[PDB]
Paper text:
Titin has a molecular weight of more than 3 MDa in its longest isoform and is over 1.5 μm in length, spanning half of a sarcomeric unit from the peripheral Z-disk to the central M-band. Taking titin kinase as the N-terminal boundary of the titin M-band segment, there are another ten Ig domains towards the far C-terminus of titin, referred to as M1 to M10, encoded by at least six exons 358–363, or Mex1 to Mex6, on the respective TTN gene. To achieve this goal, we have solved the crystal structures of five titin M-band domains: M1, M3, M4, M7, and M10. In addition to the ABDE/A’CC’FG β-sheet sandwich core, all M-band domain structures comprise two characteristic tip regions, which we refer to as “N-tip” and “C-tip” due to their proximity to the N-termini and C-termini of the respective domains.
The structure of the M4 domain was determined in two different crystal forms, with one showing a trimeric M4 domain assembly and the other revealing a disulfide-mediated dimeric state. Two other M-band domains each contain a single exposed cysteine: C20 in the M4 domain (E19 in M1) located at the A’B loop at the C-tip, and C42 in the M10 domain (F42 in M1) located at the tip of the CC’ loop near the C-tip. In one of the two crystal structures of the M4 domain, we found evidence for an intermolecular disulfide bridge across a crystallographic two-fold axis. It is mediated by two exposed cysteines, both C20 from two M4 domains at the C-tip coupled with an intermolecular Zn2+-binding site with tetragonal association of D68 (D68 in M1) and H70 (T70 in M1) from the two interacting M4 domains. By contrast, for domain M4, we found an additional higher molecular peak when using size exclusion chromatography, indicating limited dimerization. Interestingly in the presence of Zn2+, which is found in the structure of the disulfide bridge-mediated M4 tandem arrangement, we detected a further increased level of M4 domain oligomerization. In correlation with our size exclusion data, SDS-PAGE analysis under reducing and non-reducing conditions revealed a covalent higher molecular weight species, indicating intermolecular disulfide bridge formation. We show that two M-band domains with exposed cysteines (M3, M4) have limited potential for disulfide bridge-mediated linkage as purified proteins, additionally supported by a structure of a disulfide bridge-mediated M4 domain dimer (M4-SS-M4’).
Residue numbers in the entry: 4 to 99
The structure:
Amino acid sequence: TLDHAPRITLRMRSHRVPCGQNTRFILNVQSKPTAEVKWYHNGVELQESSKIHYTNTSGVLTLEILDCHTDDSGTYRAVCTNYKGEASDYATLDVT
Ligand SMILES: [Cl-]
Ligand SMILES: [Cl-]
Ligand SMILES: [Cl-]
Ligand SMILES: [Zn+2]
């Protein structure tokens, strides 16, 4: 298997979450070498915190947002990069 640009094979799902609950976005990327992943909320890069966690387990990418409020609604985007190229996916959160 030659090195290749990241390709997203399972895309995030736009969804709703009741105020105060935790939620996750999950996608799957195929990348060789392994992709560097960045996450964004309405265009602004997310950093890990008590509220935000993200992981990459062999290409399964998960963003977890804890204790969701109205301010957490909006567009979440993952960007996956290696020297061969990039892939990106986005979805919406609606906190109800
Ligand atoms: Cl896969
Ligand atoms: Cl990867
Ligand atoms: Cl965006
Ligand atoms: Zn709360």
